[PDB]
Amino acid sequence: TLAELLGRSRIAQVANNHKPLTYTGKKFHPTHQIIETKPSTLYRQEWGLKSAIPSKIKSRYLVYNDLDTLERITTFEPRGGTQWNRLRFQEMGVPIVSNIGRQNPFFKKFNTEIIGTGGLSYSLPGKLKNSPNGVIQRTVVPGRILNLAAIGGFVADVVFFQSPPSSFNSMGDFIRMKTFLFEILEASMEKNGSVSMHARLLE
Amino acid sequence: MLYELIGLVRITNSNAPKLEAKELSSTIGKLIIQNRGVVRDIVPMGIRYLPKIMKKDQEKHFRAYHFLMLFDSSAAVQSEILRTLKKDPRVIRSSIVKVDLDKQLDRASSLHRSLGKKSILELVN
């Protein structure tokens, strides 16, 4: 029947939620399903939703809550930043392992809690990564110090041998401007779904 | 009929403040039991300062000792007790208020209910 087709179809596939699109609180993982178009479909304003989406939007990705509201507008936000964070994490290549002595959940009524990682990493911890220069022991990643350090779409705890005064005290609260290199030690994941990275400042 | 009470007693003596309070509690409890009543709990509260300088007839008070007495009685009885409280010089403010027993039989004091313990069984345990 039609009903069966509807149940199958791509709008039914997007699991509904009425969480805020603007959430100024702490964001530990994606809230909403990111939805992309193709360039062609964007050109004729079609996203595979109830209505056309405004020609002002030139980004291919978005997030939404309601197909149509009482205000006669779809409730959306044109941004898909969460995919890029995931891709950055993948690039960094630091495999998430549970610091607590437990089996990997992907191997072997309902539990709504996050099964291992939320699916930002299905990488396994045992691999090395060779290159022309050699086998990479230390993962080199550029990040920004805030005061904690922003390292490729994630905030991370930082440690060092000696606190460098020349770089820090010259610009005390404009440290965000200057990008510093980092050596990421390991990535643990807590119950709330936050990725607790740990980096080391290189100079 | 379960009636809660709140009496804010006088504390004239500096070193031994609770004596007057204790005497009051004894007397009113005695009255209750003589007239078919059943005092369930006598919750003490601290030597708490009054919000304003509250005054009885030809006296003034800034600090008092507070307590709850959670007793059963007739209506008549409770009224008499209230009158006797109003009357005496060693209490600043008195307040009897009913605790409704249409649903339950065991009911703790208002403070205990606010904390969490609905019945006195919970308090005991």
């Binding site: - | 409890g29 005695k30 059943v38 709990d41 069984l121």
Partner: protein, 58 residues
């Protein structure tokens, strides 16, 4: 009719059971309750003389 009689009686029985339970609970409690003078005096002593667990918030 039989069904209706059962319905009438079952609810009454349940209510009776509840009342009995309540009574039992009251009885369990009632060691703390006071009727006599000596018990009242003991309670007073416990409350006041110990100088412990005065209900004050902070």
């Amino acid at each position: 009719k039989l069904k209706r009689n059962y319905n009438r009686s079952l609810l009454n029985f349940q209510a009776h059971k509840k009342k009995l339970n309540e009574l039992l609970n009251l009885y369990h409690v009632a060691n703390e309750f006071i009727v006599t003078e000596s018990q009242l005096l003991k309670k007073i002593d416990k409350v006041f003389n110990d100088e412990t667990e005065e209900f004050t918030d902070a």
